[PDB]
């Protein structure tokens, strides 16, 4: 297990992938969350280029936080995460957007509001155990 909340310094550009392997701590009936935030600084109060929040069994919200203010929330009812199971989450930086893979299935996209080069830190937190976190590049 990696500690949760998990914070890692990171640089992203086109071709960067962020891969997370984890498991919800409790059954989907109890609505555990997962959050992944791409921050502009190492401090947790810093702006968020890309905010990804799963309410397991219900929905996903995505947003940015810019100069401390939450922007236009995007919502998906797409729920490929399986009750009780380990997940593999992969977030890829494409030229125009983030691609979110769940268990090898394209599940969510989010157009760049801020250049991904603004990211200095990824935080993974809320009601999961974390087995793997990797930032990679092709």
Angle of CA points 96, 122, 93, to nearest 5°:
20
The reply to whether 125 sits near its own copies by the rule CB under 8 A is yes
Rounded CA-CA distance 122/25 in Å is 21
- The answer to whether the bond into 5 is cis (omega within 30° of 0) is yes
| 73 binds, options ligand BGC, its own copies, none, Cβ within 5 to 8 A by partner type | ligand BGC
The two tokens of residue 42 are: 């190492």
The reply to whether 79 sits near ligand BGC by the rule CB under 6 A is no
Of the candidate spans 4-12, 68-76, 81-89, 119-127, the one that interacts with ligand BGC by CB under 6 A turns out to be 68-76
Rounded CA-CA distance 109/118 in Å is 19
Candidate residues 34, 62, 127, 128; the one interacting with its own copies per rule CB under 8 A: 127
The reply to whether 42 sits near its own copies by the rule CB under 8 A is no
The reply to whether 133 sits near ligand BGC by the rule CB under 6 A is no
Rounded CA-CA distance 134/138 in Å is 13
Rounded CA-CA distance 67/35 in Å is 20
| 126 binds, options its own copies, ligand BGC, none, Cβ within 5 to 8 A by partner type | its own copies
| Residue 2 DSSP one-character state | B
Binding positions for ligand BGC, 34-53, rule CB under 6 A: 51, 53
Of the candidate spans 16-24, 39-47, 102-110, 122-130, the one that interacts with ligand BGC by CB under 6 A turns out to be 102-110
């Amino acid at each position: 297990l990696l500690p949760v909340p998990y914070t890692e310094a990171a640089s992203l550009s086109t071709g960067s992938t962020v891969t997370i392997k984890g498991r919800p701590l409790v059954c989907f009936l109890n609505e555990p969350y997962l959050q992944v935030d791409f921050h502009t600084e190492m401090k947790e109060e810093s702006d968020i280029v890309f905010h990804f929040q799963v309410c397991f069994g219900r929905r996903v919200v995505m947003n940015s936080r810019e100069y401390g203010a939450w922007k236009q929330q995007v919502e998906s009812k797409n729920m490929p995460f399986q009750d009780g199971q380990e997940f593999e989450l992969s977030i890829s930086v494409l030229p125009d957007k983030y691609q979110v893979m769940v268990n090898g299935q394209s599940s969510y996209t989010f157009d760049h509001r801020i250049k991904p080069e603004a990211v200095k830190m990824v935080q993974v937190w809320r009601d999961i155990s974390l087995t793997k976190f990797n930032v990679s590049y092709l």
